Design an enzyme around this catalytic site. Structure first.
Site, short mmCIF file in Angstrom:
data_model
loop_
_atom_site.label_atom_id
_atom_site.label_comp_id
_atom_site.label_asym_id
_atom_site.label_seq_id
_atom_site.Cartn_x
_atom_site.Cartn_y
_atom_site.Cartn_z
N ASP A 7 10.27 73.55 29.83
CA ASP A 7 10.87 72.26 30.03
C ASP A 7 12.34 72.45 29.64
O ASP A 7 12.65 73.45 29.02
CB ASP A 7 10.21 71.30 29.07
CG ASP A 7 10.71 69.92 29.24
OD1 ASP A 7 10.52 69.46 30.37
OD2 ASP A 7 11.30 69.30 28.33
N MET A 8 13.23 71.51 29.96
CA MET A 8 14.66 71.64 29.60
C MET A 8 15.12 70.64 28.52
O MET A 8 15.41 71.05 27.38
CB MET A 8 15.55 71.52 30.86
CG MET A 8 15.34 72.65 31.87
SD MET A 8 15.99 74.27 31.26
CE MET A 8 17.73 73.87 31.53
N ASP A 9 15.19 69.36 28.86
CA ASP A 9 15.62 68.36 27.88
C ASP A 9 14.66 68.26 26.69
O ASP A 9 13.46 68.08 26.86
CB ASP A 9 15.77 66.98 28.52
CG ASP A 9 16.77 66.97 29.66
OD1 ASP A 9 16.33 66.87 30.82
OD2 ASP A 9 18.00 67.08 29.40
N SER A 42 10.89 71.05 35.45
CA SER A 42 11.64 69.89 35.01
C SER A 42 11.77 68.72 35.98
O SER A 42 11.71 68.87 37.21
CB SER A 42 13.03 70.38 34.56
OG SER A 42 13.94 69.34 34.30
N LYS A 190 4.31 68.43 37.08
CA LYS A 190 4.66 69.81 36.79
C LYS A 190 3.50 70.80 36.93
O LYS A 190 3.70 71.89 37.48
CB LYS A 190 5.26 69.91 35.39
CG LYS A 190 6.54 69.11 35.24
CD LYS A 190 7.23 69.43 33.92
CE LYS A 190 8.50 68.59 33.74
NZ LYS A 190 9.13 68.81 32.40
N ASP A 213 7.94 68.85 25.54
CA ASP A 213 8.18 67.89 24.47
C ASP A 213 7.95 66.42 24.82
O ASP A 213 7.90 65.58 23.92
CB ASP A 213 9.62 68.00 23.98
CG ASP A 213 10.62 67.36 24.94
OD1 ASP A 213 10.67 67.81 26.12
OD2 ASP A 213 11.34 66.42 24.54
N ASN A 216 5.98 63.70 30.51
CA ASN A 216 5.87 64.34 31.81
C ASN A 216 5.45 65.79 31.71
O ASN A 216 5.34 66.47 32.73
CB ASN A 216 7.18 64.24 32.58
CG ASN A 216 8.30 64.97 31.91
OD1 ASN A 216 8.10 66.02 31.32
ND2 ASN A 216 9.50 64.43 32.02
MG LIG Z 1 11.97 67.44 27.87
#
Ligand SMILES: [Mg+2]
Length: 268
Positions: A7-9, A42, A190, A213, A216
């Site tokens: 994941d990114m954010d 993401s 995802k 985190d 989603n």
């Molecule tokens: Mg995130």
């Protein structure tokens, strides 16, 4: 372990939206050498996602738009899409709230009303590098497959009820990962996106490490054999994931990767 998905954010990215490039680059080199694949799953737009891996964009794979667009080693593999009528309906429903700001996400670009608050556009510009102002959401010449709403994810339970009847599930509300709400085609999450790459590679979830985190990331984490919740992850995500790691401001994602290379706990 044959695949590491991140994941990114709030995950791979610290709060300032950066990551340790020298460290990840060395790790990636060892992952490539070992034949292990690297995937970014993401809700963000494919074009903003590759902006974070300018030097590796054609090697690694991406599951963008929360599952609506998938690129495998530089080539577009899949993209969902709303029928012309479905989009007309969703858009018509959203426009009923003359107070709501939102982004229409398409294959070629994302779109936003030229009459949206400057502050909203700047925020969305950080998640969609291809964001074009339009006069009419209904007149967009592109295939659409997702929307991003200017509403705190805190209101998701409310959005589910409001749209449950109005859209009858044409689209489902999930978190964007950066505090807001994304409307996705049910099933195009995802995990579903990652599944397309696994099929392509002839690999199974049993070989998958996944790091997340927020909400989603639910099916992605439940799907993977090695599921990791960031230290800063939401409660239901910490519960769903079998394992844990440091928060996004302390390279949590990279520590999972490290553990894979050095074979530390869960890998050993
Ligand atoms: Mg995130």
């Amino acid at each position: 372990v044959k695949v590491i998905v991140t994941d990114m954010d709030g995950t791979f990215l610290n709060d300032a939206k950066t990551y340790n490039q020298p460290r990840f680059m060395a790790q990636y080199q060892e992952l490539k050498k070992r034949g292990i694949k690297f995937v970014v799953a993401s809700g963000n737009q494919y074009y903003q996602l590759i902006s974070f891996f300018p030097e590796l964009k054609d090697e690694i794979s991406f599951v963008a738009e929360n599952g609506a667009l998938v690129y495998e080693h530089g080539k577009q593999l899949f993209h969902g899409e709303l029928t012309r009528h479905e989009s007309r309906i969703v858009i018509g429903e959203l426009l009923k709230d003359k107070q709501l700001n939102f982004v229409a996400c398409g294959l070629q670009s994302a779109y936003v009303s030229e009459n949206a608050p400057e502050a909203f556009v700047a925020l969305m510009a950080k998640h969609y590098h291809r964001l074009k102002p339009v006069k009419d959401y209904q007149e967009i010449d592109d295939v659409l497959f997702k929307f991003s709403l200017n509403l705190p994810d805190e209101q998701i339970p409310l959005v589910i009820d409001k749209l449950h009847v109005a859209l009858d599930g044409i689209m489902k509300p999930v978190t964007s990962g950066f505090g807001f709400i994304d409307l996705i085609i049910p099933g195009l999450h995802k995990a579903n996106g990652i599944s397309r790459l696994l099929k392509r590679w002839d690999l199974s979830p049993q070989n998958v490490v996944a790091i997340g985190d927020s909400g989603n990331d639910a099916e992605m984490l439940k799907m993977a054999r090695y599921s990791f919740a960031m230290g800063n992850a939401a409660e239901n995500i910490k519960q769903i994931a079998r394992y844990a790691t440091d928060d996004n401001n302390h390279e949590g994602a990279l520590n999972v990767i490290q553990a894979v290379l050095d074979n530390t706990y869960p890998f050993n």
